[PDB]
Design a protein around this motif. Sequence first.
Motif, PDB file in Angstrom:
ATOM      1  N   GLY A   3      35.596   8.756  88.839  1.00  0.00           N
ATOM      2  CA  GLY A   3      35.457   8.370  87.427  1.00  0.00           C
ATOM      3  C   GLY A   3      34.213   9.022  86.818  1.00  0.00           C
ATOM      4  N   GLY A   4      33.944   8.730  85.546  1.00  0.00           N
ATOM      5  CA  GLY A   4      32.788   9.374  84.905  1.00  0.00           C
ATOM      6  C   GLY A   4      31.679   8.383  84.538  1.00  0.00           C
ATOM      7  N   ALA A   5      30.593   8.988  84.071  1.00  0.00           N
ATOM      8  CA  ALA A   5      29.374   8.311  83.606  1.00  0.00           C
ATOM      9  C   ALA A   5      28.751   9.247  82.568  1.00  0.00           C
ATOM     10  N   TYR A   6      28.944   8.884  81.301  1.00  0.00           N
ATOM     11  CA  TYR A   6      28.455   9.652  80.146  1.00  0.00           C
ATOM     12  C   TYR A   6      26.934   9.551  80.018  1.00  0.00           C
TER      13      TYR A   6
ATOM     14  N   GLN B   6      31.040  10.729  88.805  1.00  0.00           N
ATOM     15  CA  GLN B   6      31.080  12.135  88.458  1.00  0.00           C
ATOM     16  C   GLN B   6      30.277  12.285  87.157  1.00  0.00           C
ATOM     17  N   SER B   9      28.949  15.103  81.411  1.00  0.00           N
ATOM     18  CA  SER B   9      28.137  15.642  80.322  1.00  0.00           C
ATOM     19  C   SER B   9      26.734  16.023  80.775  1.00  0.00           C
ATOM     20  N   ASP B  50      31.086   3.806  81.303  1.00  0.00           N
ATOM     21  CA  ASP B  50      29.903   3.753  82.144  1.00  0.00           C
ATOM     22  C   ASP B  50      29.010   4.873  81.640  1.00  0.00           C
TER      23      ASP B  50
END
Lengths: 6, 223
Positions: A3-6, B6, B9, B50
Amino acid sequence: XXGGAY
Amino acid sequence: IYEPFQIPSGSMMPTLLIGDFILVEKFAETGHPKRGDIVVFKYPEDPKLDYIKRAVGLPGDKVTYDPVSKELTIQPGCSSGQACENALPVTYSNVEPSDFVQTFSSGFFEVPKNETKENGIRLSERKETLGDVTHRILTVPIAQDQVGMYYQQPGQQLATWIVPPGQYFMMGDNRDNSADSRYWGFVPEANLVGRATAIWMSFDKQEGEWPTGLRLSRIGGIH
Protein backbone atom coordinates in the motif's frame (compact mmCIF):
# COMPACT_ATOMS: atom_id res chain seq x y z
CA UNK A 1 0.63 -5.16 3.69
CA UNK A 2 2.22 -2.90 1.07
CA GLY A 3 0.00 0.00 0.00
CA GLY A 4 1.04 3.66 -0.02
CA ALA A 5 1.91 6.52 2.34
CA TYR A 6 1.59 10.02 0.85
CA ILE B 1 5.11 -5.62 15.11
CA TYR B 2 6.05 -4.05 11.81
CA GLU B 3 4.30 -3.13 8.59
CA PRO B 4 5.75 -2.39 5.14
CA PHE B 5 4.72 0.68 3.17
CA GLN B 6 5.53 1.94 -0.31
CA ILE B 7 6.69 5.56 -0.94
CA PRO B 8 4.79 6.91 -3.98
CA SER B 9 5.49 10.65 -3.67
CA GLY B 10 8.54 12.80 -3.03
CA SER B 11 7.33 14.69 0.05
CA MET B 12 10.15 13.16 2.13
CA MET B 13 13.04 13.58 -0.28
CA PRO B 14 15.94 13.13 0.03
CA THR B 15 15.45 10.99 3.18
CA LEU B 16 12.89 8.79 1.38
CA LEU B 17 12.65 8.55 -2.41
CA ILE B 18 9.84 7.54 -4.76
CA GLY B 19 10.08 3.78 -5.24
CA ASP B 20 11.36 3.15 -1.72
CA PHE B 21 9.81 0.44 0.50
CA ILE B 22 9.81 1.11 4.24
CA LEU B 23 9.41 -0.82 7.46
CA VAL B 24 7.16 0.81 10.04
CA GLU B 25 7.29 -0.01 13.73
CA LYS B 26 3.77 0.19 15.18
CA PHE B 27 3.51 2.51 18.13
CA ALA B 28 1.24 -0.27 19.49
CA GLU B 29 2.68 -0.15 26.04
CA THR B 30 1.97 2.36 23.24
CA GLY B 31 5.04 4.61 23.03
CA HIS B 32 4.72 8.20 21.83
CA PRO B 33 6.55 9.97 18.99
CA LYS B 34 9.87 11.67 19.55
CA ARG B 35 10.59 15.06 18.01
CA GLY B 36 12.17 14.42 14.61
CA ASP B 37 10.68 10.92 14.16
CA ILE B 38 9.45 9.93 10.72
CA VAL B 39 5.82 9.01 11.42
CA VAL B 40 3.14 7.36 9.31
CA PHE B 41 -0.41 8.40 10.24
CA LYS B 42 -3.99 8.65 9.10
CA TYR B 43 -4.43 11.87 7.15
CA PRO B 44 -6.82 13.98 9.26
CA GLU B 45 -8.73 15.45 6.29
CA ASP B 46 -9.20 11.93 4.83
CA PRO B 47 -8.38 9.13 7.32
CA LYS B 48 -8.66 6.65 4.45
CA LEU B 49 -5.15 7.73 3.51
CA ASP B 50 -1.89 6.98 5.27
CA TYR B 51 0.50 9.94 5.23
CA ILE B 52 4.24 9.91 6.03
CA LYS B 53 5.92 13.05 7.44
CA ARG B 54 8.30 14.14 10.19
CA ALA B 55 7.03 14.98 13.71
CA VAL B 56 8.48 18.45 14.21
CA GLY B 57 6.11 19.70 16.88
CA LEU B 58 5.15 17.83 20.02
CA PRO B 59 2.24 18.81 22.32
CA GLY B 60 2.96 22.24 23.78
CA ASP B 61 5.57 23.29 21.24
CA LYS B 62 5.36 26.71 19.63
CA VAL B 63 6.24 26.21 15.98
CA THR B 64 7.29 29.03 13.72
CA TYR B 65 8.27 28.73 10.09
CA ASP B 66 10.11 31.48 8.22
CA PRO B 67 8.96 31.27 4.56
CA VAL B 68 12.01 33.23 3.47
CA SER B 69 14.93 31.45 5.12
CA LYS B 70 12.71 28.34 5.26
CA GLU B 71 13.77 27.50 8.76
CA LEU B 72 11.89 26.12 11.74
CA THR B 73 11.79 27.51 15.23
CA ILE B 74 10.55 25.49 18.17
CA GLN B 75 9.93 26.53 21.76
CA PRO B 76 8.88 23.64 24.03
CA GLY B 77 6.54 23.88 27.00
CA CYS B 78 4.67 26.84 25.50
CA SER B 79 1.57 25.07 26.76
CA SER B 80 -0.34 27.83 28.55
CA GLY B 81 1.29 30.17 26.04
CA GLN B 82 3.37 31.53 28.93
CA ALA B 83 6.86 32.96 28.39
CA CYS B 84 7.91 29.36 27.75
CA GLU B 85 11.32 27.71 27.91
CA ASN B 86 14.32 28.49 25.72
CA ALA B 87 14.19 27.85 21.99
CA LEU B 88 14.96 24.25 21.11
CA PRO B 89 18.31 24.26 19.28
CA VAL B 90 17.34 24.08 15.60
CA THR B 91 20.51 24.17 13.52
CA TYR B 92 20.98 24.38 9.74
CA SER B 93 24.02 23.65 7.54
CA ASN B 94 24.97 25.76 4.51
CA VAL B 95 22.60 25.43 1.58
CA GLU B 96 24.14 23.31 -1.16
CA PRO B 97 23.09 21.76 -4.47
CA SER B 98 21.21 18.51 -3.80
CA ASP B 99 21.41 15.52 -6.15
CA PHE B 100 17.98 15.99 -7.73
CA VAL B 101 16.19 18.35 -10.03
CA GLN B 102 12.49 19.14 -10.24
CA THR B 103 10.99 19.56 -13.72
CA PHE B 104 7.64 21.10 -14.71
CA SER B 105 5.03 21.13 -17.50
CA SER B 106 5.95 17.41 -12.30
CA GLY B 107 8.90 15.05 -11.89
CA PHE B 108 12.11 14.45 -9.96
CA PHE B 109 15.45 13.23 -11.30
CA GLU B 110 18.66 12.18 -9.58
CA VAL B 111 21.20 14.15 -11.59
CA PRO B 112 24.98 14.81 -11.35
CA LYS B 113 25.46 18.15 -9.54
CA ASN B 114 27.12 19.67 -12.60
CA GLU B 115 24.31 19.05 -15.06
CA THR B 116 21.06 20.96 -15.65
CA LYS B 117 17.72 19.79 -17.01
CA GLU B 118 15.50 21.73 -19.40
CA ASN B 119 12.49 23.23 -17.61
CA GLY B 120 13.99 21.98 -14.39
CA ILE B 121 15.43 23.51 -11.24
CA ARG B 122 18.28 22.23 -9.05
CA LEU B 123 16.97 21.72 -5.55
CA SER B 124 18.96 22.84 -2.52
CA GLU B 125 19.96 20.24 0.03
CA ARG B 126 20.81 21.11 3.62
CA LYS B 127 20.86 19.61 7.08
CA GLU B 128 18.44 20.41 9.87
CA THR B 129 18.87 19.40 13.48
CA LEU B 130 15.78 19.20 15.67
CA GLY B 131 17.55 19.17 19.00
CA ASP B 132 19.99 16.27 18.67
CA VAL B 133 18.39 14.44 15.74
CA THR B 134 19.80 15.56 12.38
CA HIS B 135 18.38 14.91 8.93
CA ARG B 136 18.31 16.51 5.51
CA ILE B 137 15.64 18.58 3.69
CA LEU B 138 15.36 19.82 0.12
CA THR B 139 14.28 23.31 -0.97
CA VAL B 140 13.30 24.62 -4.37
CA PRO B 141 15.16 27.97 -4.62
CA ILE B 142 12.64 29.63 -6.94
CA ALA B 143 9.70 28.98 -4.65
CA GLN B 144 8.31 30.40 -1.42
CA ASP B 145 5.28 29.57 0.68
CA GLN B 146 2.11 31.57 0.18
CA VAL B 147 1.22 32.27 3.81
CA GLY B 148 -2.32 32.91 2.59
CA MET B 149 -3.00 29.22 2.00
CA TYR B 150 -1.50 28.32 5.41
CA TYR B 151 -3.79 26.89 8.05
CA GLN B 152 -4.23 29.68 10.58
CA GLN B 153 -4.61 28.72 14.20
CA PRO B 154 -7.45 30.56 15.99
CA GLY B 155 -5.71 33.43 17.74
CA GLN B 156 -2.28 32.78 16.24
CA GLN B 157 -0.34 35.04 13.90
CA LEU B 158 0.21 33.61 10.42
CA ALA B 159 3.09 31.10 10.19
CA THR B 160 3.03 30.28 13.90
CA TRP B 161 1.35 27.38 15.69
CA ILE B 162 1.04 26.36 19.34
CA VAL B 163 0.50 22.60 19.35
CA PRO B 164 -2.50 21.44 21.44
CA PRO B 165 -2.27 18.52 23.91
CA GLY B 166 -2.30 15.10 22.28
CA GLN B 167 -1.64 16.75 18.92
CA TYR B 168 1.36 16.89 16.59
CA PHE B 169 2.78 19.18 13.89
CA MET B 170 4.06 17.35 10.77
CA MET B 171 6.36 18.52 7.98
CA GLY B 172 7.90 16.85 4.95
CA ASP B 173 11.62 16.87 4.27
CA ASN B 174 10.91 18.02 0.68
CA ARG B 175 9.78 21.32 2.27
CA ASP B 176 8.46 23.11 -0.82
CA ASN B 177 6.67 19.96 -2.05
CA SER B 178 4.78 18.74 1.01
CA ALA B 179 1.12 19.10 1.95
CA ASP B 180 1.79 19.00 5.70
CA SER B 181 0.62 20.63 8.95
CA ARG B 182 1.45 24.05 7.43
CA TYR B 183 -1.71 23.65 5.36
CA TRP B 184 -4.13 21.35 7.15
CA GLY B 185 -3.42 21.66 10.84
CA PHE B 186 -2.41 19.22 13.53
CA VAL B 187 -2.53 15.45 13.76
CA PRO B 188 -4.21 13.75 16.73
CA GLU B 189 -2.41 11.10 18.77
CA ALA B 190 -5.01 8.53 17.71
CA ASN B 191 -4.19 8.91 14.01
CA LEU B 192 -0.57 7.90 14.58
CA VAL B 193 0.23 4.49 13.08
CA GLY B 194 3.93 4.26 13.75
CA ARG B 195 7.56 5.18 13.25
CA ALA B 196 9.43 4.48 10.01
CA THR B 197 12.70 2.76 10.87
CA ALA B 198 14.07 1.34 7.62
CA ILE B 199 14.02 0.80 3.87
CA TRP B 200 13.89 -2.87 2.88
CA MET B 201 13.54 -2.47 -0.90
CA SER B 202 13.98 0.34 -3.39
CA PHE B 203 13.15 0.72 -7.08
CA ASP B 204 14.42 3.66 -9.14
CA LYS B 205 11.07 4.84 -10.49
CA GLN B 206 9.11 7.92 -11.57
CA GLU B 207 5.70 8.01 -9.83
CA GLY B 208 2.92 6.47 -11.90
CA GLU B 209 5.03 3.92 -13.78
CA TRP B 210 7.13 0.80 -13.32
CA PRO B 211 10.82 0.69 -12.22
CA THR B 212 13.85 1.80 -14.25
CA GLY B 213 16.03 -0.39 -12.03
CA LEU B 214 17.00 -1.13 -8.45
CA ARG B 215 18.57 0.81 -5.60
CA LEU B 216 19.67 -1.96 -3.24
CA SER B 217 22.14 0.61 -1.98
CA ARG B 218 19.32 2.28 -0.03
CA ILE B 219 18.40 -0.73 2.10
CA GLY B 220 19.21 0.29 5.69
CA GLY B 221 18.02 2.54 8.49
CA ILE B 222 16.68 6.08 8.12
CA HIS B 223 16.03 8.91 10.58
